[PDB]
mmCIF file of C-alpha atoms and ligand atoms in Angstrom:
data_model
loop_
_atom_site.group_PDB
_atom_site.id
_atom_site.type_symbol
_atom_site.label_atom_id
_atom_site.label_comp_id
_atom_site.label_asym_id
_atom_site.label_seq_id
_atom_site.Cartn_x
_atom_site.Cartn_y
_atom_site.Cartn_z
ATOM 1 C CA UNK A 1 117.515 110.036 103.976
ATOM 2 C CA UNK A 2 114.943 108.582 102.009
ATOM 3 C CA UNK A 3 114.816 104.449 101.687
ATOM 4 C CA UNK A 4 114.962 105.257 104.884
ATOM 5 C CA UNK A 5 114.386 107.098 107.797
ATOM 6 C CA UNK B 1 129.782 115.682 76.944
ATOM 7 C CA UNK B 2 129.478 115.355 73.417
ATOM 8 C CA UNK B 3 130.704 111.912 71.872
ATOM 9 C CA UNK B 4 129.610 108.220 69.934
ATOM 10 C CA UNK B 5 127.367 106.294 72.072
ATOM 11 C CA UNK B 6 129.453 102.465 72.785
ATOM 12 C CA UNK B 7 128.343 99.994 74.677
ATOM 13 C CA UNK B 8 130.831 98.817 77.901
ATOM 14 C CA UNK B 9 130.769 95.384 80.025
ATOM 15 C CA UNK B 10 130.956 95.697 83.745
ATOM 16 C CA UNK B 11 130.084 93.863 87.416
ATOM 17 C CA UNK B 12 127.610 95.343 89.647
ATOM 18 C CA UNK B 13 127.572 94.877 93.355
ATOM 19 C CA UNK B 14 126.168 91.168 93.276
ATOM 20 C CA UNK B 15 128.731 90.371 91.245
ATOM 21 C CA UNK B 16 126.640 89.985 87.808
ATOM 22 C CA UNK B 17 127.988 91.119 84.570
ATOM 23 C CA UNK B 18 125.622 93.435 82.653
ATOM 24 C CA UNK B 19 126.326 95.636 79.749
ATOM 25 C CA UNK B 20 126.256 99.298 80.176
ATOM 26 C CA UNK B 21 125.451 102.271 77.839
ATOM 27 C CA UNK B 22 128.250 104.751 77.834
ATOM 28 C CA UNK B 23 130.319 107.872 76.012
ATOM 29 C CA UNK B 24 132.714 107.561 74.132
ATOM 30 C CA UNK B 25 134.949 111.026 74.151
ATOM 31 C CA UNK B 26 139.070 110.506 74.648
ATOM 32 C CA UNK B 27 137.509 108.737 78.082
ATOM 33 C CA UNK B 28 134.344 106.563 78.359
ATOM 34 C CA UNK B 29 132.058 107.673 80.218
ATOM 35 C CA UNK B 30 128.662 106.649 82.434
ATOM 36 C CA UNK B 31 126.241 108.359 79.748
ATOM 37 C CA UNK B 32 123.540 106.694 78.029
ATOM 38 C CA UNK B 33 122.270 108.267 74.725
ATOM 39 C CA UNK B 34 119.678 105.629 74.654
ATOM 40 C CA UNK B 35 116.858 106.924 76.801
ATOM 41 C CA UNK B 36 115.433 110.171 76.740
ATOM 42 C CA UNK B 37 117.756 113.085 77.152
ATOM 43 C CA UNK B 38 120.541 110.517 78.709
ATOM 44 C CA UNK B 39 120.924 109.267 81.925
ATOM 45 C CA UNK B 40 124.367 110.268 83.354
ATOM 46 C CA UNK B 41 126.174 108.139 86.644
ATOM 47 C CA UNK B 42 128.809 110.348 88.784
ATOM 48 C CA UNK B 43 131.337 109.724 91.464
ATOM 49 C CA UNK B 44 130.948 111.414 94.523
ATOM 50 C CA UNK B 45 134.534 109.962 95.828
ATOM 51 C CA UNK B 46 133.439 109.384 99.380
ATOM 52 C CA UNK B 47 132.383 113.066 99.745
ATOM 53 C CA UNK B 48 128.822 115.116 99.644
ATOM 54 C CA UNK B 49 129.398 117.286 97.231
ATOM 55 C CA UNK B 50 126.787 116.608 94.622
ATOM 56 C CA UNK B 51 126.778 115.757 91.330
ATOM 57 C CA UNK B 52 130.709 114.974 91.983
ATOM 58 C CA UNK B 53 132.980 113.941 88.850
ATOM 59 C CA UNK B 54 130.974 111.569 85.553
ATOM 60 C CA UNK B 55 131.714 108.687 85.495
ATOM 61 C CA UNK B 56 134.947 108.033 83.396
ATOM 62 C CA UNK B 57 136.277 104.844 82.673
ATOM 63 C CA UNK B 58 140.161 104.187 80.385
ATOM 64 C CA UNK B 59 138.400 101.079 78.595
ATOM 65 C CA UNK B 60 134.602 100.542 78.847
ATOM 66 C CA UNK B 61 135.237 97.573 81.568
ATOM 67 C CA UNK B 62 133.799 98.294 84.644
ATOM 68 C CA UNK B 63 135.117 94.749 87.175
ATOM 69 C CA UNK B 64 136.305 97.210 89.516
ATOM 70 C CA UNK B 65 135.084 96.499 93.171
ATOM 71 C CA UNK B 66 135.139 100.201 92.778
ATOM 72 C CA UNK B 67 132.866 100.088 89.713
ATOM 73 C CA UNK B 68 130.059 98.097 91.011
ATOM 74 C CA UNK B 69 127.632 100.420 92.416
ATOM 75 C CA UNK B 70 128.680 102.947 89.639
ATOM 76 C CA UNK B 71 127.225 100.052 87.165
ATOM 77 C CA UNK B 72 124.033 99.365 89.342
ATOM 78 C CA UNK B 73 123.015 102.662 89.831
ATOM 79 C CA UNK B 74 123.305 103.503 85.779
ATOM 80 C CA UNK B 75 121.798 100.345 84.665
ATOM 81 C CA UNK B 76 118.865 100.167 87.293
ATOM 82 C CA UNK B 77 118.384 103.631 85.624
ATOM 83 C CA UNK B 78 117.498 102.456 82.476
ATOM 84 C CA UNK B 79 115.641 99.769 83.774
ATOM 85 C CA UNK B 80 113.494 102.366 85.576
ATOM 86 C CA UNK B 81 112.725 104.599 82.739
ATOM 87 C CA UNK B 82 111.977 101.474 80.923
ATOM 88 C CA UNK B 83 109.550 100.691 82.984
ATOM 89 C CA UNK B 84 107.750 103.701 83.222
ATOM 90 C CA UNK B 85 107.725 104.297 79.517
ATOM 91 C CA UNK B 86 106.458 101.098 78.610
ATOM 92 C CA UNK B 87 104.256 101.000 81.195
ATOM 93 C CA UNK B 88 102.794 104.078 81.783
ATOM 94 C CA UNK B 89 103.925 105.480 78.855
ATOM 95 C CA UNK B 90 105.559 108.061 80.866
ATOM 96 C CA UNK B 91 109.036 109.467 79.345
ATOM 97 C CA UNK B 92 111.496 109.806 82.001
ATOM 98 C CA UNK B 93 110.023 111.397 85.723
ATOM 99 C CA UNK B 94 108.798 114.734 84.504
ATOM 100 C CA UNK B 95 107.524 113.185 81.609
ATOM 101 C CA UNK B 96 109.508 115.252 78.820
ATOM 102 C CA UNK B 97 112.644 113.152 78.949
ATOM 103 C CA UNK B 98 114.537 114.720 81.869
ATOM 104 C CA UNK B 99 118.115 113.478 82.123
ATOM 105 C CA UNK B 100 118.505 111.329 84.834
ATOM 106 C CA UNK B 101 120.983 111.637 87.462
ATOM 107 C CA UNK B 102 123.126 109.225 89.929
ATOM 108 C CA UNK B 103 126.041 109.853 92.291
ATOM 109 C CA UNK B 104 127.357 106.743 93.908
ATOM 110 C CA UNK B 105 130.088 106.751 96.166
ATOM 111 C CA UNK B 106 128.465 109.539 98.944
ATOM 112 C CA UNK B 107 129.677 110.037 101.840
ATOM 113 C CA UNK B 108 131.763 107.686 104.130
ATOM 114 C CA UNK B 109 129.543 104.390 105.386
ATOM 115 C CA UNK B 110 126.610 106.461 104.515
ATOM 116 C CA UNK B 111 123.632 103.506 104.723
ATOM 117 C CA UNK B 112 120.990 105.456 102.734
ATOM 118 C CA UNK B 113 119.765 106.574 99.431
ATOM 119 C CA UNK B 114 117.642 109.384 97.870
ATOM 120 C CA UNK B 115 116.384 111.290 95.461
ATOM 121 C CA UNK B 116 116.671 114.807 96.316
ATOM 122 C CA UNK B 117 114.174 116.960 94.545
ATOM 123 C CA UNK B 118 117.046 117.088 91.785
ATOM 124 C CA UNK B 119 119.552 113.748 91.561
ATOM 125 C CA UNK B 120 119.926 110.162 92.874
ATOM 126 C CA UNK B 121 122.468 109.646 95.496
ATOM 127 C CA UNK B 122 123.699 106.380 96.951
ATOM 128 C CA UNK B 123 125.733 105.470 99.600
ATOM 129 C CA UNK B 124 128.231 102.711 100.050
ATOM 130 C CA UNK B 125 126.969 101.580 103.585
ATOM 131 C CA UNK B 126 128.839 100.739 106.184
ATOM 132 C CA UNK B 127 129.281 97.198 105.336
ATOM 133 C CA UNK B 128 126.769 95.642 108.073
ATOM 134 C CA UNK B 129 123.826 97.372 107.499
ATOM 135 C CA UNK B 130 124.347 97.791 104.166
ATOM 136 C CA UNK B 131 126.420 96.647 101.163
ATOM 137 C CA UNK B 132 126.112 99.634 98.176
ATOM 138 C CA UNK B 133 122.731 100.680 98.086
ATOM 139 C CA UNK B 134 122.293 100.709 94.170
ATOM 140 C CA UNK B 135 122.589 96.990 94.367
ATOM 141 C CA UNK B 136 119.173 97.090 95.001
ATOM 142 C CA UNK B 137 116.495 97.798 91.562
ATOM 143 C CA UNK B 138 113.817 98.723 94.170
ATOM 144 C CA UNK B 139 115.851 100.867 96.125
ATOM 145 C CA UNK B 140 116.994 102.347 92.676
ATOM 146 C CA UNK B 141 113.228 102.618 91.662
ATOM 147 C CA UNK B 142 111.728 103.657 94.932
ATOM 148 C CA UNK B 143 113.774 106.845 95.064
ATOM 149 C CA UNK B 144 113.231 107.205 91.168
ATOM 150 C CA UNK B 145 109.568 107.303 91.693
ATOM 151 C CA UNK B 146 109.892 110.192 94.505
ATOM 152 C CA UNK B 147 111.107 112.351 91.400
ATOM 153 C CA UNK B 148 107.982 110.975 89.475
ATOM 154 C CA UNK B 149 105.965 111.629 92.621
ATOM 155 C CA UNK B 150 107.915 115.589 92.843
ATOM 156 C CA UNK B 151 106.275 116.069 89.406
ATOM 157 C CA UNK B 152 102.924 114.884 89.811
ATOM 158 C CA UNK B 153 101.275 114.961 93.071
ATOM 159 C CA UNK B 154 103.930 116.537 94.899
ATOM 160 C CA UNK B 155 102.677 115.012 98.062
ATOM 161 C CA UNK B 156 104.233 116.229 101.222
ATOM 162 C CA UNK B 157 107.111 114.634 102.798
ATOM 163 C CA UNK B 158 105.137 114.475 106.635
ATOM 164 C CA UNK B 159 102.553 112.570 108.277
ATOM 165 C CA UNK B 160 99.632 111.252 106.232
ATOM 166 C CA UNK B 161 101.005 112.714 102.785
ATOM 167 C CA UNK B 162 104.341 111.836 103.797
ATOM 168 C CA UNK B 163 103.231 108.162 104.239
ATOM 169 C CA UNK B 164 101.790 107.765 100.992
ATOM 170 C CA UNK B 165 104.451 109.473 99.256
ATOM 171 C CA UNK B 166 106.837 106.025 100.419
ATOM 172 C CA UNK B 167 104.100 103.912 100.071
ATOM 173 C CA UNK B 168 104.356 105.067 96.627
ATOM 174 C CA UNK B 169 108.078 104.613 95.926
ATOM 175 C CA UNK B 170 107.828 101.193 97.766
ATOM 176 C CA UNK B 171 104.656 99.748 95.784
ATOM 177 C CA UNK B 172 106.486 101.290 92.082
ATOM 178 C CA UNK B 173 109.778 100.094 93.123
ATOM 179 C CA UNK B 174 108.430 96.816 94.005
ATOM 180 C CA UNK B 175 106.637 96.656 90.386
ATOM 181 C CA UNK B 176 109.690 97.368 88.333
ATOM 182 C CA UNK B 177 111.790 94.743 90.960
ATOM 183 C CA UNK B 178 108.971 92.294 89.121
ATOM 184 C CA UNK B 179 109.517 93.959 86.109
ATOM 185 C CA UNK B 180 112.799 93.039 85.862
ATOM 186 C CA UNK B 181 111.996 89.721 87.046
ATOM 187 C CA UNK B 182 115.366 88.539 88.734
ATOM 188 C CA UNK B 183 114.165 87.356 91.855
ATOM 189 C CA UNK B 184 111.121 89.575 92.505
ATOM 190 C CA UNK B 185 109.360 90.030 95.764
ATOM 191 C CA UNK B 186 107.022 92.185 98.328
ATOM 192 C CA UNK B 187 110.274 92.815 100.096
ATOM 193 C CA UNK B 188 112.073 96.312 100.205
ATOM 194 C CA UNK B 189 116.053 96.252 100.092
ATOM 195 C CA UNK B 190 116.627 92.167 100.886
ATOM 196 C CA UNK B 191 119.126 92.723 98.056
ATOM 197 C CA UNK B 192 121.553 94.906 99.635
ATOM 198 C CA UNK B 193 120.706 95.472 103.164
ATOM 199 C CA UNK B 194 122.242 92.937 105.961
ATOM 200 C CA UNK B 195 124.708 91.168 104.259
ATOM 201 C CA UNK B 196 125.742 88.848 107.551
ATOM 202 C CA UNK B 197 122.064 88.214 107.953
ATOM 203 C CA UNK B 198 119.501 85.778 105.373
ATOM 204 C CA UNK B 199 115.848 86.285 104.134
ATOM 205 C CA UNK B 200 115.323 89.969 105.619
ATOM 206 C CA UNK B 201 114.650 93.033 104.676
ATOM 207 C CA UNK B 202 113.997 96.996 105.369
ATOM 208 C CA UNK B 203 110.031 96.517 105.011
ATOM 209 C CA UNK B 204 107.505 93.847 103.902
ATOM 210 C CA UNK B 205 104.565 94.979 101.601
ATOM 211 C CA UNK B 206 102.981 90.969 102.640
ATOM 212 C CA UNK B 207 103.401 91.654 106.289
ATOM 213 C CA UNK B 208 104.416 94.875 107.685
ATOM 214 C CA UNK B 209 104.484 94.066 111.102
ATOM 215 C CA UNK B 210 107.853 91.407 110.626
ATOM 216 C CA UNK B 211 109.901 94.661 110.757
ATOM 217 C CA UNK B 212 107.248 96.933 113.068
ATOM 218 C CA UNK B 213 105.337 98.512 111.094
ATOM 219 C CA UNK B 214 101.763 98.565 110.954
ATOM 220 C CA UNK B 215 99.474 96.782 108.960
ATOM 221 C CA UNK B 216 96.469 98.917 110.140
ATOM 222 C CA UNK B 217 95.273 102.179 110.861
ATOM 223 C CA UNK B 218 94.546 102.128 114.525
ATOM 224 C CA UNK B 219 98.054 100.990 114.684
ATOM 225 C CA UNK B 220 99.166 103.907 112.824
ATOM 226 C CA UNK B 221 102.097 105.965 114.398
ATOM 227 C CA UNK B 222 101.498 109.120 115.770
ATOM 228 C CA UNK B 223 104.407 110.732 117.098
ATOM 229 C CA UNK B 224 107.531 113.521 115.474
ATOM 230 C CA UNK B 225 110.120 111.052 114.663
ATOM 231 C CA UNK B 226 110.798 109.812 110.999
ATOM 232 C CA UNK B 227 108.813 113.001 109.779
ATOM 233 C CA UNK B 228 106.118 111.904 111.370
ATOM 234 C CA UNK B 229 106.138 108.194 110.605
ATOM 235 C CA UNK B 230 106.569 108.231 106.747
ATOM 236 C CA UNK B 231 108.461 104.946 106.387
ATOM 237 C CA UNK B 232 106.331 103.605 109.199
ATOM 238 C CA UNK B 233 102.586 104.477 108.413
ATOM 239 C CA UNK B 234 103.879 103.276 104.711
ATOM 240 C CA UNK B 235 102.721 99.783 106.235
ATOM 241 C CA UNK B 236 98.712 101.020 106.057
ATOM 242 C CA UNK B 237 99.465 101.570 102.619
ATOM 243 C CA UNK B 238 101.680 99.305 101.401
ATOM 244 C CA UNK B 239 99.697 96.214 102.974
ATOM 245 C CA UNK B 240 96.386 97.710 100.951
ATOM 246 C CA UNK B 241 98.898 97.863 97.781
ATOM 247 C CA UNK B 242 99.810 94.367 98.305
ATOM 248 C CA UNK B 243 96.119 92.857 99.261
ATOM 249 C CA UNK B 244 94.835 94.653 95.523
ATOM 250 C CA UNK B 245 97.354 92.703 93.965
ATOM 251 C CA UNK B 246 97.860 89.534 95.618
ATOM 252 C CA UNK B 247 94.410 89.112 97.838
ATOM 253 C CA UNK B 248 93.757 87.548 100.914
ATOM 254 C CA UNK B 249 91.943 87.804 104.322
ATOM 255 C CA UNK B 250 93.502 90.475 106.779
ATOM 256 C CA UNK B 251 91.587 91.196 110.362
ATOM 257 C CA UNK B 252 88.721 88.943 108.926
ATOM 258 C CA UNK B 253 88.260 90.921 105.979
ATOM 259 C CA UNK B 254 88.986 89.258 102.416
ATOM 260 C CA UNK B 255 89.972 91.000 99.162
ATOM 261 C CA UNK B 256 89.924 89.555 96.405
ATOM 262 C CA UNK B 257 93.483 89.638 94.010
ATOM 263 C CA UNK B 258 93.565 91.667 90.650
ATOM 264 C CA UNK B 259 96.990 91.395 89.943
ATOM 265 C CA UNK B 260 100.561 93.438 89.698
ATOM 266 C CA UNK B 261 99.191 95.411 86.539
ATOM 267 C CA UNK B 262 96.324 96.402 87.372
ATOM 268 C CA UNK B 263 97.541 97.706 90.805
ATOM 269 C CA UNK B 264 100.272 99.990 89.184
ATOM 270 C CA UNK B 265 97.657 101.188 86.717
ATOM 271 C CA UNK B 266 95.259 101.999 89.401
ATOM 272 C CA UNK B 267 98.289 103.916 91.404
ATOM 273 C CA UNK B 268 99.825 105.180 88.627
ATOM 274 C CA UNK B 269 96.480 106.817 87.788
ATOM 275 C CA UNK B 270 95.661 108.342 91.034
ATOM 276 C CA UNK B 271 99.000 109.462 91.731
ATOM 277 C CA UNK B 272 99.026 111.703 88.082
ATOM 278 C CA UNK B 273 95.258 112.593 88.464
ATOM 279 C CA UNK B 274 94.089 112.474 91.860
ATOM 280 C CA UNK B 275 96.479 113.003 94.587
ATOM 281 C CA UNK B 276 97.991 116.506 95.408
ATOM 282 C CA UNK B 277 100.195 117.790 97.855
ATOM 283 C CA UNK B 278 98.197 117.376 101.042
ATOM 284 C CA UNK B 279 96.260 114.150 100.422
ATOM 285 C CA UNK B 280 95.869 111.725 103.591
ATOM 286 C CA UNK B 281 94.706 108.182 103.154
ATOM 287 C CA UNK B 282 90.861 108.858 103.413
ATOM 288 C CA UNK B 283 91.756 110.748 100.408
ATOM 289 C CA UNK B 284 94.386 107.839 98.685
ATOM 290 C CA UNK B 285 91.443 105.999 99.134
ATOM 291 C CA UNK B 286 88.978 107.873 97.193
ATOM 292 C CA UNK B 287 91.754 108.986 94.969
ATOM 293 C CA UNK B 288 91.840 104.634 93.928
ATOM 294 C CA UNK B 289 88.582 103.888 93.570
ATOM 295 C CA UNK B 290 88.301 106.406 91.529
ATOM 296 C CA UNK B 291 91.075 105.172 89.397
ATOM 297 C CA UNK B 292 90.027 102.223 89.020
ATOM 298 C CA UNK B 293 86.582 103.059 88.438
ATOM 299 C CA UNK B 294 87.971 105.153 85.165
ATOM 300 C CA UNK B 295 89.809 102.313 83.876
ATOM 301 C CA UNK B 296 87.713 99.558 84.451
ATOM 302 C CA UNK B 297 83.793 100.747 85.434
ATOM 303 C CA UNK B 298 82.204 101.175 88.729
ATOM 304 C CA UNK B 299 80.482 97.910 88.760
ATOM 305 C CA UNK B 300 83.901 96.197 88.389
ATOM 306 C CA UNK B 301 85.865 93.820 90.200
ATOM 307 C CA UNK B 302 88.515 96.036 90.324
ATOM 308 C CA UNK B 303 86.816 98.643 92.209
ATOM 309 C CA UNK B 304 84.957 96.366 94.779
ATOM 310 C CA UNK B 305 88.738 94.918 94.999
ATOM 311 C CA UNK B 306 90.386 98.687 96.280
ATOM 312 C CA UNK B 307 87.489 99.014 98.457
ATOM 313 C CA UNK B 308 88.187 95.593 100.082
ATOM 314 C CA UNK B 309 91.316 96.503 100.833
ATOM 315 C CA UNK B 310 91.044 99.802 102.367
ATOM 316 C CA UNK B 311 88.786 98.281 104.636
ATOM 317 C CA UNK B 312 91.270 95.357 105.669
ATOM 318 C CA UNK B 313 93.776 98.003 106.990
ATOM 319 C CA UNK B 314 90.875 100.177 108.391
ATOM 320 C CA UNK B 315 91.677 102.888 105.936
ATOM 321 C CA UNK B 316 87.431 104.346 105.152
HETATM 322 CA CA1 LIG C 1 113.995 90.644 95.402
HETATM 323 CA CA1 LIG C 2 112.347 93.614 96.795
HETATM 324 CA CA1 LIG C 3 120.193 90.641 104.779
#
């Protein structure tokens, strides 16, 4: 999870 | 694994040919000698385990439907070290050449990507939400600049720190989407996200508040979800980011534009010099003037520009 939440 | 660098020919997820540095040993593989110490692409085969398999290939063509995020992820790579090395003249994300690592192919429908604290990793998506995520060069160089971020100013992945730590990997990823210059924008993920739907995206640098998020602090978000709001409160930062760059008048304040380069030399600079692990954005700002006071005086445009636009998103 990280380009998004 | 030890071999002759070749060059292959594949299709990426838009369907665009692009050649690809690879490996050549009995197999060809999805390593490029080129760049620092390499930059490897791996198949995690619809599972999490991480790295999974490298990438090997019978005949250096990569047409595959299967191939095309494979090719994305390993060329938007390159592009990404290219950018920070000729830019910033910053060699690879710790800045001694680290080899740089992508699994594509994780999970089943997975409609995410990230860097995480070691590796890339890309999902396929699920098809609606999301076509394969390396598809997009600013997803590839948003979660790219979290490792440059891990290295640096290791800013903390909550709240205020959290916040500026995507604002970061949006406002790089957005530069090296220009960079590249096929069909730049202040959009993050139009490329591969939505494929039923036209002309959106996952967040707007030019207008946060098209997708919800805010576009000023007394709009910031508050609350325990999303880590505290890190791909929310990115807004406040990424609409500063954007003013800097582009200007304009937001809330009745104006800033006046400096351009793309000078932005990612400002942020470049306070991200490597200034910012540490628990900086909030009273401190990003200070952290920018700063930065741009160093590289272009006090009295300068520059600087009276980054205070402008902390001001327009009510950031003092
Ligand atoms: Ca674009
Ligand atoms: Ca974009
Ligand atoms: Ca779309």
């Amino acid at each position: 999870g990280a380009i998004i939440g | 694994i030890t071999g002759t660098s070749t060059v292959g020919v594949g299709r990426g997820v838009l369907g665009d040919q692009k050649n690809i540095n690879t490996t050549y040993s009995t197999y060809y593989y999805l390593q490029d000698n080129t760049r620092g110490n390499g930059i490897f692409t791996y198949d995690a085969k619809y599972r999490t385990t991480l790295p999974g398999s490298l990438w090997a290939d019978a005949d250096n063509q990569f047409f595959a439907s299967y191939d095309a995020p494979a090719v994305d992820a390993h060329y938007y790579a390159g592009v990404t070290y290219d950018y920070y090395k000729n830019v910033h003249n910053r060699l690879s994300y710790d800045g001694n050449n680290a080899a740089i690592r992508s699994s594509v192919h994780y999970s089943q429908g997975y409609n995410n990507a990230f860097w995480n604290g070691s590796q890339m990793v890309y999902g396929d998506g699920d098809g609606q939400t999301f076509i394969p995520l390396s598809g997009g060069i600013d997803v590839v160089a948003h979660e790219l600049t979290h490792a440059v971020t891990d290295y640096t100013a290791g800013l903390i992945y909550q709240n205020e720190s959290g916040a500026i730590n995507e604002a970061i990997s949006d406002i790089f990823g957005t530069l090296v989407e220009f960079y590249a210059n096929k069909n730049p924008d202040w959009e993050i993920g139009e490329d591969v996200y939505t494929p039923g739907i036209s002309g959106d995206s996952l967040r707007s640098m030019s207008d946060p508040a098209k997708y919800g998020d805010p576009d000023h602090y007394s709009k910031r978000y508050t609350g325990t979800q999303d880590n505290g709001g890190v791909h929310i409160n990115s807004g406040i930062i990424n609409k500063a980011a954007y003013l800097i760059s582009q200007g304009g008048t937001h809330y009745g304040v104006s800033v006046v534009g400096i351009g793309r380069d000078k932005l990612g030399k400002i942020f470049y600079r306070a991200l490597t010099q200034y910012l540490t692990p628990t900086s909030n954005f009273s401190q990003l700002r200070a952290a920018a003037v700063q930065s741009a006071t160093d590289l272009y005086g006090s009295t300068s445009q520059e600087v009276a520009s980054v205070k402008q636009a902390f001001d327009a998103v009510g950031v003092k």
